[PDB]
Amino acid sequence: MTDQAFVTLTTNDAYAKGALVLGSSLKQHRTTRRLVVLATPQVSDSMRKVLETVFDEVIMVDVLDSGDSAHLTLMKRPELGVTLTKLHCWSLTQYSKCVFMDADTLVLANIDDLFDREELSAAPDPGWPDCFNSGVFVYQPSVETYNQLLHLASEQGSFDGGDQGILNTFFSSWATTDIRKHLPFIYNLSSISIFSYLPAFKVFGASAKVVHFLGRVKPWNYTYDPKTKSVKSEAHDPNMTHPEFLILWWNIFTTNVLPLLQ
Amino acid sequence: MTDQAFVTLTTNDAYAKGALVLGSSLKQHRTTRRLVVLATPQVSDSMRKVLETVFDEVIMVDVLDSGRPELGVTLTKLHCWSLTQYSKCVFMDADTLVLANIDDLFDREELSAAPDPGWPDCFNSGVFVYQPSVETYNQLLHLASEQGSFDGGDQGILNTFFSSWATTDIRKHLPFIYNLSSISIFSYLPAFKVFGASAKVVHFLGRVKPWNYTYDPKTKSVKSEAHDPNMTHPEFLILWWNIFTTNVLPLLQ
Numbered sequence A: 001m002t003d004q005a006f007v008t009l010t011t012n013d014a015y016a017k018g019a020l021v022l023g024s025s026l027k028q029h030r031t032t033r034r035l036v037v038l039a040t041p042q043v044s045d046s047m048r049k050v051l052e053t054v055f056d057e058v059i060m061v062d063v064l065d066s067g068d069s070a071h072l073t074l075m076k077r078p079e080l081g082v083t084l085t086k087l088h089c090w091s092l093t094q095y096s097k098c099v100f101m102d103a104d105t106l107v108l109a110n111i112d113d114l115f116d117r118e119e120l121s122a123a124p125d126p127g128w129p130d131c132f133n134s135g136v137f138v139y140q141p142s143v144e145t146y147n148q149l150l151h152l153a154s155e156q157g158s159f160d161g162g163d164q165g166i167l168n169t170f171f172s173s174w175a176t177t178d179i180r181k182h183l184p185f186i187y188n189l190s191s192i193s194i195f196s197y198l199p200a201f202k203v204f205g206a207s208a209k210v211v212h213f214l215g216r217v218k219p220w221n222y223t224y225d226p227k228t229k230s231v232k233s234e235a236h237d238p239n240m241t242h243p244e245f246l247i248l249w250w251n252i253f254t255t256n257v258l259p260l261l262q
Numbered sequence B: 001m002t003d004q005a006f007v008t009l010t011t012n013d014a015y016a017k018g019a020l021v022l023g024s025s026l027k028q029h030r031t032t033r034r035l036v037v038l039a040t041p042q043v044s045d046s047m048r049k050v051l052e053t054v055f056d057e058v059i060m061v062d063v064l065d066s067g068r069p070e071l072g073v074t075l076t077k078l079h080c081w082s083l084t085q086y087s088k089c090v091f092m093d094a095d096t097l098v099l100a101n102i103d104d105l106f107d108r109e110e111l112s113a114a115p116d117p118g119w120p121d122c123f124n125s126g127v128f129v130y131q132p133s134v135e136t137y138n139q140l141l142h143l144a145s146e147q148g149s150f151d152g153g154d155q156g157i158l159n160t161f162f163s164s165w166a167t168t169d170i171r172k173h174l175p176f177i178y179n180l181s182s183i184s185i186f187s188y189l190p191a192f193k194v195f196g197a198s199a200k201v202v203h204f205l206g207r208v209k210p211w212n213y214t215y216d217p218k219t220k221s222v223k224s225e226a227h228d229p230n231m232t233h234p235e236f237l238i239l240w241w242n243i244f245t246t247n248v249l250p251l252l253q
């Protein structure tokens, strides 16, 4: 109501375009909750103003960077040290409960029923499903938890160099303790860009509630032709096996977001 | 006890090599349960006899085929429910390898399995705990006939029949240590580096099986002529080939 929020993060203007599409999609599906975006100083002044037209609030935060090149190299994503910035989401005690969503997500149906869930509720990671994917999660802001998380990050770091490792470590009961903290995979459908063959998608994909463009290739990295509605397909590319979501992203961007960027 | 078993399946002499390595590895790690392999008539008479040496029972069954096109025969797994001489069994694909004792799987209840990478609200059917039952068997055969499988193999059928696995009982979700595939290691290497030493079962899931790699015992190394998109973990291939060379190959050659 005033008490609960969807929260996302952008540290630059590229992911900000993702944030804008996510925000638009939440509004399209008539959330009754607040929309908030955490932004760092690399987000341009002009992009912050655009974010303000979609989000109820833009909250400026400091970048938190693991600096963990060794574990980010294992992850194959040397840029993701800045995802520790996500931890600031726990500082938002103006809200009693929030859903964090990655800026590379897209909402396909109303998902306000997530606010029935308890901290920490998340869906399984598509590659290592004993860990939860940290791109969509239900949590409770808390100065206590925020401080504990910052401390763990500074003392031990993260096994993957980013937020997902440290969050899985801190919330390590997730895989075995309480099945009500497992979100269905359709609330974080995160395998499409990185798995070539997904037979389950063909029978269950139509029920997707949130699609998550997990992996190095983001929808905004494509060249989209709005005349024919084609994307230049980038060589071998699992997005093109099931391109409906990438197409949708660009539809929302071109129709609902591009006019705000004028 | 004698009323519980590990059960595997081979429909041909190639997968029989996997079954032999798996059974050898279960002996290596001192299982106290029986070892059973389901075999079809396409397994040669000589290989069936070799299997009878490693396994406690070699049970002949008919191929069930849904109609990787070779995978239609994986419906043959459904025969595992016919083994009512056992109260509880762990089914393991012929392309798995045990690294440590896993007899504690018999504390689990039907249907216990690990989440499948790529769509983890379905379980991977390469390792599962089940209870033999003629009723269940008949029901699975019925489903296979009337609806078929959404993936053309056993996994679709089994996930359809046991459709509340993802949401009902978390004790039926097996951790990765009982079914670790190289797809997972490739997808999230950081997790493998911190947790991976705990693995008790390796699953060589995908088109290129260990017996499709060539192994040079002189250089202690492996390579495959066909590209392996699952990036099979080389250390695991070496463990497989070490067991095969010393324990299995002398029975065949």
Ligand SMILES: O=c1ccn([C@@H]2O[C@H](COP(=O)(O)OP(=O)(O)O)[C@@H](O)[C@H]2O)c(=O)[nH]1
Pocket (backbone or CB within 6 Å): A008, A009, A010, A011, A012, A015, A079, A080, A082, A083, A101, A102, A103, A104, A105, A135, A213, A214, A215, A216
């Ligand atoms: O340079 C970056 C990288 C990441 N992010 C934020 O951190 C999230 C996690 O990164 P990403 O989605 O790239 O990780 P993946 O889901 O691919 O593992 C993003 O969605 C953004 O919200 C960001 O703001 N700037």
Ligand SMILES: O=c1ccn([C@@H]2O[C@H](COP(=O)(O)OP(=O)(O)O)[C@@H](O)[C@H]2O)c(=O)[nH]1
Pocket (backbone or CB within 6 Å): B008, B009, B010, B011, B012, B015, B070, B071, B073, B074, B092, B093, B094, B095, B096, B126, B204, B205, B206, B207
């Ligand atoms: O031609 C075949 C194909 C498969 N199988 C059996 O069915 C299982 C499942 O197939 P596979 O492990 O190849 O599937 P994957 O795990 O790679 O998806 C195998 O391990 C074998 O036990 C068999 O006996 N003959």
Ligand SMILES: OC[C@H]1O[C@H](O)[C@H](O)[C@@H](O)[C@@H]1O
Pocket (backbone or CB within 6 Å): A080, A083, A102, A133, A134, A135, A136, A160, A161, A162, A163, A164, A165, A214
């Ligand atoms: O740990 C860094 C990143 O990897 C994870 O797999 C998640 O998809 C993403 O939300 C997280 O920020």
Ligand SMILES: OC[C@H]1O[C@H](O)[C@H](O)[C@@H](O)[C@@H]1O
Pocket (backbone or CB within 6 Å): B071, B074, B093, B124, B125, B126, B127, B151, B152, B153, B154, B155, B156, B205
């Ligand atoms: O259903 C087809 C096959 O592939 C599955 O993903 C499982 O790993 C395997 O045991 C099954 O037989």
Ligand SMILES: [Mn+2]
Pocket (backbone or CB within 6 Å): A102, A103, A104, A105, A135, A212, A213, A214, A215
């Ligand atoms: Mn993401």
Ligand SMILES: [Mn+2]
Pocket (backbone or CB within 6 Å): B093, B094, B095, B096, B126, B203, B204, B205, B206
């Ligand atoms: Mn297999």
